[PDB]
Design a protein around this ligand. Structure first.
Ligand code: HDD
Ligand code: HDD
Ligand code: HDD
Ligand code: CA
Ligand code: CA
Ligand code: CA
Ligand code: CA
Ligand code: CA
Lengths: 678, 674, 319
């Protein structure tokens, strides 16, 4: 049973009714005569059409495009030695969760595979209240003060005269903002890396970004960072793949997640923290209140608290995924805020914005937002009020309700409490802390920590986007900021856009590196289960279908998702060449019985000219494992200009030997030697 | 019940947020003990955001009202006249919720304004919710729903200064009545005692429109709904209503609440008039015209079942403020008619709930939910509380095996339009000439009132029209009233210093009809719940003894007794300072309190002359009054008076007084025109 | 002409139109025959009734019952010696105002003459932005922390099972809260005095209640209290009179104000402050941050800043 089974409505049987249970029809209007006008007294028509007319709600102001699933969090230990948080207070303690992943800039119909920051928002339905960690797949944020959020978001969203371009920072306004607001450099470098185009929601991490506090029942506190570390491994698309995939399958990430859960491959993350003392706020060479900075893992290692597993898809997307209303204000005893001016302002935004989405104040009553423990408070009325409150004296202090509900605090009722060592001192100021002023060292730290091909991909992303900026003042200003992180980056980017990079400014240049931020560097994937193999076959040769069937059995044994492609559907063929694309596969195999489909003269009314070969070629050029199974590889590899001796290029007669080799190629995931370097 | 499932108990436990996190809510989080409040105080903001958003728009009409739960019980299997499931078996019980209301006043306006009153009943039937959205007056002001904003704008406050509240006593309203002669019939009802009912329990309910009863063979008859009070018909007098407006704006809602808590839940016989389709234009008017009644002489009432209200709400806002009635809530066995007022209502009540609820899922509110399964392809919308398992919500489908199934006359107990219904003719914005007699039935109503009732109606018109500033509107009002009755126009004209126009006898007649008079409806069938004020004193132990003896003799018979004295103690319920004659249906002075009634009497504990003014007001307003055990001389009240009691004995005082409570009003105390 | 003349719509001439300017009728529904059913294609009907169906907005959560007027504020001096405020920077400088007066507990159709605290909310449409002083006719408030406001208001508003009683603190819940929350005593005594039943909005004062700051252009600050002193005089009803007036004329205060303006007797207040140093926050025997306390005038006299005069009634109450 779903955790929301009490709210489910079954329509597998029965006669149509109105919303008030009156049996009706809904297929023909009531008319004055068989060719007559429709009657106002047709309530069947008007209740159905009113409902339809009002189906839509405002999309989220940011993160409008996303997808969610149910699962379970399991604690690895009793963490009462660092936090009073009930959901962390025992080894094996289980708490239901709901997670939504998202992009940031695009509207709710935009492509999953846009280049962007991604959301990773987790609700823990704890036995002491709902606790939300509203995170991103990038551990740092663009800006240092919440009051700037509309500036950032206006600049990266479409230009407001014509609403162009969708789901993209590749326009003047965005790069104007980045180059005028240098705090943006750290997140910008992350977004221009493969972290901007993750392979799936399952192949990315989650970060709380802000420093938070863990608070013990004795009132002592520690400073923490949340890290959700993918047990699937880290992987990226390449940009020229992501662009085609945005058109061929705008739903790629939500389909990948849905399919993984349905196949019993529900994705997993270790929920981890960095834990440091209050005295270390300004010990690591930056301010822990500054959300543009990471704590390098060399300074503070990750502690694994527990397992997050997503294993149940929603029943109704709108009701569960569209309506889930996360808040960092959803906090529990044992956790506290910090004076990070970005986190501080968020606490206001997420309570207010639900009024816009829900249209009224009772949004916590929606099934997906309800807690799994009793609610005792004097909140009342409001549009859409579902509860029927018995307590006729909803004020404190009272005698006529015997003093209930009772106040909860540090000493009674397991109340939330502010960390009691927290203080404030000084002038009431609209001033930025000078401790926040180094906007360039950590972007350089990140860039330094990427592999050479990874550095090239980041340069190439900047070359792509900045070449689309029309303004020559903005392009020059961008090169001024990039040059403060890396003169080499500025020179390489400047080469694509026909400007000269400004002279080196070495104030913030350094050669330090940090582990765990590189994708290319994180080694082969720990599992290839769920990865997608396209087998290109033909109906023109019964032996090509036999090769494909033998390949399927052997690949499916290992938990790969196999698609057999041919000219037309039949038993054992999943997909036509017409609907197939290399963006649909993590590796491509041609059965040598189909080699004739790869000829330059090959033509069919059943698929676009050159489609079989284009699938193989795109897969090779995008770095995927590719091969020909059966022993006759020359005709295909030569048509594709693919060298038989290439890394991640497989040619074997033996199906078993083909699959053993090819499976190592899928774990490698990308063959980076196929990309040119400056 | 959807209601039982959503009840929230806060009789124990620690305070939590709406997401179950234990919190406090009495002190703001601050930067130091004398410091500014922090934005990160989520406890503060969630509490104050909820408070800031508590209010919803009041209803566009009938904003002021009160509701209760109960049961409807069928007297029979009515299959012979309707397919309606709630009427298909002797003793069949259906839960109900009723809301009673005024019309013009906003949410906080007085119950005892002079107005039309709502009487809206939801039957939570086993074939869907069925609402009869009625009033206490059987005819409506206008003949086409498109005119409703014109009527309501005219009766509601003038829109430059929003004056006056809950009152038709202003130029705009009487401008409308005089220019729109269809208004005359309801205007005469509202100017009668029906404008100021004694309680919701002492008025009837009417569907107003002709509806149809439709059998499972497809045949139809025309019907009128009448809910006939078992408590009897009773009114206030106008002065009393005005004082009550100030002393207790909650009088009708308190009366209803208290009757239910005391086990005196009000009852009505749910009745219909039934006539054949061929009789639509047989009674001298059009049954599509909502300004006309069928005289009971032409079509008697058939009793279908018992409506009883016997449980108060748990949360007023969630149940009473949020109940969203609709004539569109119809069930198989009932159909509409081509009454142009009913026709347009059907649109209004679906649309307006979007304004009140702020989103389209208002039928999901517990008070709006049915008591049977919902099966349909309505989806999404703000505030969606369901999780629909059918992922193919379209018809026709194969992917959900063709469910839900279409319901119609043949199968699934579908609603169906009466299959004898037709339309013929041009597409017109034309009024039927059959609707054009605006004056005969107002005169029938006026003729059917007793002489003192006719005087009260003339005096209500004298009161309101005298407050009309425009001499031209007042003349136009007399022109219209004169077409109903020259005598009424002459008597009204005398109060405002104008001459009545010459008699215009076109619509004059001397016909009468039973069952519309209050004064004529005879003694109340029960005195239970009626209020007796016993005026006593703490001075004399004999006065308190006398009051306690009367108390036991009257409470025996189900009377709500208030003993009044200078100060509270054991046996005294109320001080003279808080007491008023509008609080009582009868007033008894114990002779031991004689000293309080002298003109010389004064106290810092109550206003000068309060005890005598309660007795004198009760007398002037027609109520049974008496002394048990000087007082009558002070009050200038004659001992021989009808409804004036003077007994040394408590037993014989009471036996006599209780006959007076049943009589209810002594109308010989009101002056008549010569 | 009104300060809002640019937004006015004249209907003293012309033919009925839809909201998009199409001439129409609005007195008979379109029907399939003269005794027929109403047609869905009747857009004249639906646009008109849709508008009607959606006329209402939520009443204010408190102070739902009230009435307003336009007028003018005129500064008596250049107050740059104590504040940078532009509306106070020159003798004779005029700023348009709008004021709304109100009760607190009653819903928008409740009687003006209920016993209650009253609102006095003033907008100054200044040449450096709108400045509102949202005050009451009593200088002290029931509670010392905004987080308690729903507690106070739930207790004073009708009991939530039956919504009784209207516009009145005369019920168990209110006196339960007063007796358990002793901060309430000062405002309670004011509300139980004639200040709870003023003769008119014109015969009551306005108070900011809180200590605010006046800030000079040089950055220095002083602590102030706002006091709007009635030029009409202070006057009350007696309680028995108020109870009868509630029934005989629920609109008494709004009519009194409307009529005073139409007769050329637009009400006036001297807009005054008490001015004390920051060092005097705890000097008077109580804390100036505590909204349950007044500064006795014997400790800090009133300085007259300017004249507030209300002299124009609204054109559309709702708008
Ligand atoms: C001051 C405003 C502001 C700031 C500074 C941020 N956000 Fe935010 N965010 C919002 C204002 C907001 C919002 C407008 O309140 C949204 C839109 C929908 C919602 O519920 O909240 C939101 C949505 C939103 C979602 C989507 C949740 C879901 O799937 O429904 C995620 C994952 C984040 N944000 C994450 C972040 C992170 C990791 C930030 C910086 C560390 C951040 N936001 C800063
Ligand atoms: C064309 C519009 C229109 C017309 C002609 C009428 N009404 Fe109506 N009425 C409404 C439009 C409306 C409304 C605006 O839709 C309301 C306000 C709140 C609601 O639910 O519906 C309403 C409320 C309302 C209520 C209050 C229900 C409750 O307690 O919540 C009652 C009892 C009635 N009406 C009764 C009548 C009767 C007996 C009428 C004539 C026979 C009538 N109305 C004509
Ligand atoms: C924490 C909430 C809160 C607190 C502590 C107060 N109020 Fe308030 N008040 C509101 C929350 C509110 C509100 C809910 O926000 C209202 C309802 C309508 C509106 O615009 O604001 C309001 C309305 C309102 C109005 C009506 C304005 C109008 O005519 O439209 C006045 C005069 C006051 N208040 C005056 C005060 C005074 C003098 C207070 C104490 C010194 C006070 N309020 C405390
Ligand atoms: Ca742009
Ligand atoms: Ca990469
Ligand atoms: Ca008027
Ligand atoms: Ca109470
Ligand atoms: Ca006084």
């Amino acid at each position: 049973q779903s955790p929301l089974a009490a709210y489910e409505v079954d329509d597998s049987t029965g006669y149509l009714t109105s919303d008030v249970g009156g049996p009706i029809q809904d297929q023909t209007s009531l008319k004055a005569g068989i060719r007559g006008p429709t009657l106002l007294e047709d309530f069947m028509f008007r209740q159905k059409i009113q409902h339809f007319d009002h189906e839509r709600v405002p999309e989220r102001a940011v993160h409008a495009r996303g997808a969610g699933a149910h699962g379970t969090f399991t604690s690895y230990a009793d963490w009462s030695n660092i936090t009073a948080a009930s959901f962390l207070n025992a080894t094996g303690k289980q708490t239901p969760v709901f997670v939504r992943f998202s992009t940031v800039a695009g509207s709710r119909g935009s492509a999953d595979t846009a280049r962007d920051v991604h959301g990773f928002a987790t609700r823990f339905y704890t036995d002491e209240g709902n606790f939300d960690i509203v995170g991103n797949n990038i551990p740092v944020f663009f800006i240092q003060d919440a009051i700037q959020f509309p500036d950032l978001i206006h600049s990266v969203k479409p230009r407001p005269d014509n609403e162009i371009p969708q789901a993209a920072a590749a326009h003047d306004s965005a790069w104007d903002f980045f180059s005028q607001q240098p705090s943006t450099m750290h997140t910008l470098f992350w977004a221009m890396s493969g972290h901007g185009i993750p392979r799936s929601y399952r192949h990315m991490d989650g970060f709380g970004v802000h420093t938070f506090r863990f608070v013990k029942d004795d009132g002592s506190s520690k400073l923490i960072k949340w890290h959700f570390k993918s047990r699937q491994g880290k992987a990226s698309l390449v940009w020229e793949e992501a662009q085609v995939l945005s058109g061929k399958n705008a739903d790629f990430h939500r389909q990948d997640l849905w399919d993984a859960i349905e196949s019993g491959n529900g994705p997993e993350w270790d929920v981890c923290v960095q834990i440091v003392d209050e005295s270390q706020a300004q010990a690591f060479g930056f301010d822990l209140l500054d959300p543009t900075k990471i704590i390098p893992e060399e300074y503070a290692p990750l502690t694994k608290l527990g397992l997050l597993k997503l294993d149940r898809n929603p029943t109704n997307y709108f009701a569960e995924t569209e309506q889930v209303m996360f808040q960092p204000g959803h906090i529990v005893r044992g956790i506290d805020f910090t004076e990070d001016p970005l986190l501080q302002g968020r606490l206001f935004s997420y309570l207010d914005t639900q009024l816009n989405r829900n249209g009224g104040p009772n949004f916590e009553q929606l099934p997906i937002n309800m807690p799994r423990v009793p609610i005792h408070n004097n909140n009342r009325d409001g549009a859409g009020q579902m509860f029927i409150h018995r307590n006729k004296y909803p004020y404190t202090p009272n005698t006529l309700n015997s003093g209930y509900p009772r106040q909860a605090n540090q000493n009674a009722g397991r109340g939330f409490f502010t960390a009691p060592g927290r203080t404030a001192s000084g002038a009431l100021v609209r001033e930025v802390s000078p401790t926040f002023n180094d906007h360039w060292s950590q972007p350089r730290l990140f860039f330094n920590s990427l592999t050479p091909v990874e550095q090239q991909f980041l340069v190439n992303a900047m070359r792509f986007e900045i070449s689309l900026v029309k303004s020559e003042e903005v392009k020059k200003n961008v090169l001024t900021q990039l040059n403060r992180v890396s003169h080499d980056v500025a020179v390489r980017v400047a080469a694509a856009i026909g400007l000269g990079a400004p002279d080196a400014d070495d104030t913030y240049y350094h050669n330090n590196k940090t582990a765990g931020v590189s994708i290319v560097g994180s080694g082969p994937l720990p599992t290839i289960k769920t990865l997608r193999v396209g087998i290109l076959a033909t109906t023109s040769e019964s032996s090509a279908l036999d090769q494909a069937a033998q390949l399927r059995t052997r690949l499916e044994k290992d938990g790969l998702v196999v698609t057999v492609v041919a000219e037309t559907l039949r038993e054992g063929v999943d997909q036509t060449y017409s609907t197939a694309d290399a963006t649909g596969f993590d590796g491509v195999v041609v059965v040598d019985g189909a080699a004739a489909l790869f000829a330059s003269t090959a033509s069919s009314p059943l698929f676009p000219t050159g489609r079989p070969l284009q699938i193989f070629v795109d897969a090779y050029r995008w770095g995927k494992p590719v091969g020909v199974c059966g022993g006759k590889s020359s005709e295909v590899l030569d048509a594709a200009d693919v060298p038989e001796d290439g890394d991640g290029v497989y040619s074997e007669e033996s199906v078993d030997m083909f699959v053993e080799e090819f499976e190592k190629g899928l774990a490698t995931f990308r063959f980076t030697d196929r990309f040119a370097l400056d």
